[PDB]
Design an enzyme around this catalytic site. Structure first.
Site, PDB file in Angstrom:
ATOM      1  N   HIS A 138       0.802  -1.243   0.000  1.00  0.00           N
ATOM      2  CA  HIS A 138       0.000   0.000   0.000  1.00  0.00           C
ATOM      3  C   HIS A 138       0.827   1.282   0.000  1.00  0.00           C
ATOM      4  O   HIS A 138       0.277   2.391   0.111  1.00  0.00           O
ATOM      5  CB  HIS A 138      -0.954   0.050   1.179  1.00  0.00           C
ATOM      6  CG  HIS A 138      -1.749  -1.210   1.359  1.00  0.00           C
ATOM      7  ND1 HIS A 138      -2.551  -1.731   0.369  1.00  0.00           N
ATOM      8  CD2 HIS A 138      -1.863  -2.044   2.415  1.00  0.00           C
ATOM      9  CE1 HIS A 138      -3.124  -2.836   0.802  1.00  0.00           C
ATOM     10  NE2 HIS A 138      -2.721  -3.048   2.043  1.00  0.00           N
TER      11      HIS A 138
ATOM     12  N   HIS B  22      -7.326  -4.769  -0.826  1.00  0.00           N
ATOM     13  CA  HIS B  22      -6.663  -6.056  -0.823  1.00  0.00           C
ATOM     14  C   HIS B  22      -7.255  -6.917  -1.915  1.00  0.00           C
ATOM     15  O   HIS B  22      -7.052  -8.129  -1.904  1.00  0.00           O
ATOM     16  CB  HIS B  22      -6.902  -6.797   0.478  1.00  0.00           C
ATOM     17  CG  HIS B  22      -6.331  -6.121   1.674  1.00  0.00           C
ATOM     18  ND1 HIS B  22      -7.122  -5.636   2.694  1.00  0.00           N
ATOM     19  CD2 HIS B  22      -5.051  -5.845   2.021  1.00  0.00           C
ATOM     20  CE1 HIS B  22      -6.352  -5.090   3.621  1.00  0.00           C
ATOM     21  NE2 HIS B  22      -5.092  -5.203   3.239  1.00  0.00           N
TER      22      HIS B  22
END
EC number: 2.7.1.121
Lengths: 336, 336
Positions: B47, B198
């Site tokens: 991320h 995700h």
């Protein structure tokens, strides 16, 4: 129009910028800034944040976007330069592509004819291929960003146009770049080695084996392809004509101090760019190169291409001082 | 190990950070900073720049990266908090995922059991799906970044732990996000609408018609999915136990002032994010929302996913002052 929406969005997002219409271009909201050399660039859209993200104090006074991968027309360049002219001349930074050289050199003459003191700096840092698809000589790529910042700092401190121009031509001879793509913006587990920011072919297509190995190949190429002699034309404003200047690059060598730019061409995860940087530091240390500063991020893109480039720019204490100087732009921001 | 190389690269690129080993975590090079509340977050890698790019003055004291899309183990969290503890408590910001809640909650107890005053803030800003694959409730996504900056400013100026925690919980109830993907990190000309960082499924798969139409649907969803009541546990350090706190969100409505974050989930060209911002401003103006500040860029990604998210956080003058306060981190830098 999507391009229209994108520029309106840039304008709404950044009140320090002013988007002009008829013709379209972007400047610092406070331009013209009296008493400082004004710095301008431009080129096709699709390389964002280059060049509009670089408009601001300590960097570009303004920029001229064109359509995708297409040079802005001369009217945009002329009007943008007139708008930013602070009475001390305008310096035009031009990347080495057929279309950009033509349109910027045309604007340059129109400016000259209208009394504006102008001169130019051509960028040809891509060491990969001589005479690609839209270039006579070597392609102008990410080192353009490092040059805008350094020459931008020099203009902001008050250097003359001649001084800003000589510094940009010097940096151009000391900066070397190479890019790779793993996917365009066509074969599995293959990479286009020495790719161009418009999608131009590279040296070849070769297997991708690992990140570390790709970096090793890119770094090795920067070391061995550094030597370069060529003519770069510049506008002599006193004679009012183009001067052909033979320009020389020395290869990067043991003992050089450098600024490193690890640049996302579009869709490379930032985690991967840090891995690139890790390998690059090891190789510079082994070759006697001291990385003194770095930039790691998306600074000169090619739409959504998957790949990245490495730029190394030789510097000294004076240049490092220009690096550390303040810059306030959408893409780059640091204070004293 | 690639993660090892990537973290070594981050550390070599940023001397303002210290990478620790046994266990692995990253802190401000100057931590512990005596007399200020310390702020920490963490989560799976993939991320970037969240959260390591937010470590620095005015923001995180440190962060605990885990393996890809996987929570750091509680030893990493514990040791990082012990390293940054400045004697005034440590505030842990946790995104709402099963694995993150469990590991940070376990570290919180170990910290408490070792004499460290600590408390928590859970982020659950994604309005799209309730109880996705790795989450009880709503998923924590990009608003996490805005909260770290605001709470980071409050901590930096000296606010107490309780004051920093209260602010964080309040902001959490005022920030709303939604993401879309056109490609995983599926279908043609189709998008996963309300996707998770995700790869979790969204509300549905639907046709991509245009950028403007996609933004309209995302924005409509932020308006209609805003109302939410749920329980969030937090660590009561005085009692030494988890406290179940019913928390409430009001939908966004006419008259709200917001900070907008247009965030690249991975492979979306910056030019397109500005087009997104342009349409967002029009929709906010029609709905009666005033965008006071914005962030446009890659701030909370999902590897190389092709997509983007929009986050709108309701703010007031006090909150806007914390936004404008100085921040000096790899990803965010300003002095005014």
């Amino acid at each position: 129009d999507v391009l229209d929406e994108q520029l309106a969005g840039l304008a709404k997002a950044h009140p320090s910028l002013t988007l002009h219409q008829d013709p379209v271009y972007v400047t610092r909201a406070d331009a013209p800034v009296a008493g400082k050399v004004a710095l301008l660039s431009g080129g096709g859209s699709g390389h964002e944040p280059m060049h509009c993200g670089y408009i601001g104090q300590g960097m570009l006074s303004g920029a001229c976007p064109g359509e995708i991968f297409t040079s802005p027309t001369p009217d945009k360049i002329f009007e943008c330069a007139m708008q930013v002219d602070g009475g001390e001349g305008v310096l035009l930074i031009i990347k080495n592509y057929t279309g950009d050289i033509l349109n910027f050199e045309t604007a340059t003459e129109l400016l000259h004819d209208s009394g504006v003191k102008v001169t130019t700096v051509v960028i040809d840092d891509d060491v990969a291929v001589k005479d690609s698809l839209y270039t006579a000589g070597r392609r102008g790529v990410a080192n353009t960003v490092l040059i805008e910042k350094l020459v931008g700092a020099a203009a902001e401190r008050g250097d003359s146009l001649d001084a800003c121009a000589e510094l940009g031509r010097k940096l151009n001879n000391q900066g070397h770049s190479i890019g790779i793509a793993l996917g365009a913006c066509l074969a599995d587990n293959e990479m286009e080695f020495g790719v161009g920011i418009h999608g131009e072919p590279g040296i070849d297509r070769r297997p991708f084996s690992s990140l570390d190995q790709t970096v090793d190949e890119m770094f090795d190429t920067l070391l061995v392809n550094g030597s370069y002699h060529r003519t770069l034309r510049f506008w002599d404003y006193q004679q009012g004509s183009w001067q052909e200047e033979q320009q020389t690059k020395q290869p990067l060598q043991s003992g050089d101090r450098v600024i490193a730019l690890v640049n996302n061409l579009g869709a490379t995860p930032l985690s991967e760019l840090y891995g690139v940087y890790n390998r690059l530091t090891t190789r510079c240390q082994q070759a006697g190169l001291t990385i003194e500063r770095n930039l790691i991020g998306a600074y000169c893109t090619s739409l959504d291409m998957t790949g990245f480039s490495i730029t190394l720019l030789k510097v000294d204490d004076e240049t490092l001082a220009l690096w550390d100087a303040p810059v306030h732009t959408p893409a780059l921001n640091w204070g004293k």
